[PDB]
Structure 1
Amino acid sequence: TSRNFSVGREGLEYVWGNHEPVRVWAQESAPGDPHGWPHEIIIHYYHRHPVYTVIVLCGVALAILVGTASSAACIAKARRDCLTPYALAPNATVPTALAVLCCI
């Protein structure tokens, strides 16, 4: 027959019949490349440590999301501040730099 035994970094020890104990330790030989493209890096560090990897990826996602949201809110508030005085007044001879910057 055949028996599968998971071996961690701390290691494993097995005795088969009357033979002496045999000890084996697991490597960090995950499939991927820490110094390659991002997909390889995430594959490597997810196979090594799935929970920690998922945590850092979700943290990065939250960071980019809140950064984009804050930037959007700030540009919208700047548009409000620099436009509402002119929208309440006639003949808004606006230098188009502000609008062209903050319309998109």
Structure 2
Amino acid sequence: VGMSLLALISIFASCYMLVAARSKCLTPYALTPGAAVPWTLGILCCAPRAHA
């Protein structure tokens, strides 16, 4: 039980950190009426798939 719980905690923390890094990297692009740099769009998935 202890090992399983620690593994789940670690994987959840890593996933949360990836999501937070994505949000921090793609936060300034929603404050401008600009393009999303498809080079970055491919690597960093975002909610706008085709619009903007």
Which structure would you say has the larger Rg? Answer: 1
Counterpart amino acid of residue 99 in structure 1: C
Larger relative contact order (C-alpha < 8 A, sep ≥ 6)?
2
Q: CA RMSD in A?
A: 1.7
Question: How many percent identity over aligned positions?
Answer: 40
**Greater helix share, structure number:** 2
Paired with 2:35 and 2:21, the residues of 1 have a C-alpha distance of: 17
2:14 matched residue in structure 1: 71
Q: Per-residue deviation at 1:76?
A: 1.3
The match for 2:44 is: 98
Superposition pairs of residues 23-102 of structure 1, within 5 angstroms = 58-94=1-37, 95-96=40-41, 97-99=43-45
TM-score normalized by structure 1?
Answer: 0.37
**How big is the shift at 1:78?**
0.2
List runs of 5+ in structure 2 lacking aligned partners.
47-52
Stretches of structure 1 lacking an aligned partner (at least 5 in a row): 1-57
Q: Which runs of 4+ in 1 moved over 6 A?
A: none
Give the TM-score taking structure 2 as reference length. 0.64
